[PDB]
């Protein structure tokens, strides 16, 4: 599925940059331009979210106690609770991805980089499976870039 592939690639790469610190040099899939401009959007908006809410993010991380790969399904359950009111918007989506990056940095420092890709896949799975038609109607990652453009 093209939507799942592109979403996972953007989220996989963003979570991997935040934990490791290096950008991935390898070329993207078929999207290309849209995936790059979504990552620039994620680096601008997502890094700001993590810095301006570091107090809240650090407290959430300690009480969620993300240790191994079976704790990684906990953020997918948090996503379901986030959306349980029926509201979907880009601000919630970018915030969940930024907390995923915040968790990914912590996984590297506790020697669990093993868990980062499973985290990115479950974040992408919930996003794409539960909100596919919303994403398509918002023009996917092109609308995500358009929403956070200034």
């Amino acid at each position: 599925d093209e939507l799942y592939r592109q979403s996972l690639e953007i989220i996989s790469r963003y979570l991997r940059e935040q934990a490791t610190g290096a950008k991935d040099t390898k070329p993207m899939g078929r999207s290309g331009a849209t995936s790059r401009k979504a990552l620039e959007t994620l680096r601008r908006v997502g890094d700001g979210v993590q810095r301006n809410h570091e107090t809240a993010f650090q407290g959430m991380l300690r009480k969620l106690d993300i240790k191994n790969e079976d704790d990684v399904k906990s953020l997918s359950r948090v996503m379901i609770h986030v959306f349980s009111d029926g509201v979907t918007n880009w601000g919630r989506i970018v915030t969940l991805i930024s907390f995923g990056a915040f968790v990914a940095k912590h996984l590297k420092t506790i020697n669990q980089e093993s868990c980062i890709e499973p985290l990115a896949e479950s974040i992408t799975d919930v996003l794409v499976r539960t909100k596919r038609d919303w994403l398509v109607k918002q023009r996917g990652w092109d609308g995500f870039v358009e929403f956070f453009h200034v």
């Binding site: 979210v49 809410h53 906990s74 009111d85 601000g91």
Partner: protein, 168 residues
């Protein structure tokens, strides 16, 4: 008027913070009437984190939605460049006071979790923790409401200073 864009964002930011305070209060009261296991406590933790993420995400969405309406107004000729930069700066000040309130409620709920773990035991301390959290959460919310009204008051005065410049 274009300061309706700022007023709308001010009301939305205060509503999201007020709804977050109400969600955290009901989660604590549900956990206080309940007898907690380790699994029930972790479900409550996931619901608290979701409430924080939802509040932050919805505040972010409202501010970016407010900035789109302002840019709209600049391209429609209903505001000039100096008025738009005052509107965008007022929306940035709303974003910061709203972010601080969300951080304070998350830090406040953390202290509440420490009381539901440690002191909990006896209906009387139960009810004092409930009112302690209720009081401190509303304090956070009203401080945001007042700071948000002040940010609009700052925008309306910088709008009257730009008209007072004339064309000089």
């Amino acid at each position: 008027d274009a300061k309706k864009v700022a007023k709308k964002a001010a009301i939305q930011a205060a509503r999201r913070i007020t709804e977050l305070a109400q969600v955290l209060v009901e989660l604590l009261k549900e956990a206080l009437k309940l007898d907690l296991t380790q699994e029930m406590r972790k479900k409550l933790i996931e619901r608290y984190a979701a409430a924080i993420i939802r509040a932050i995400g919805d505040i972010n969405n409202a501010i970016y939605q407010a900035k789109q309406e302002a840019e709209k107004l600049k391209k429609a000729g209903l505001v000039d460049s100096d008025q738009l930069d005052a509107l965008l700066r007022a929306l940035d000040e709303l974003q910061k006071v709203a972010s601080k309130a969300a951080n304070q409620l998350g830090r406040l709920f953390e202290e509440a979790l420490k009381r539901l773990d440690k002191d909990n035991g006896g209906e009387e301390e139960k009810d004092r923790t409930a009112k302690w959290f209720e009081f401190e959460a509303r304090a956070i919310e009203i401080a945001l409401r007042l700071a948000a009204i002040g940010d609009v008051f700052d925008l309306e005065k910088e709008w009257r200073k730009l008209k007072s410049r004339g064309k000089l």
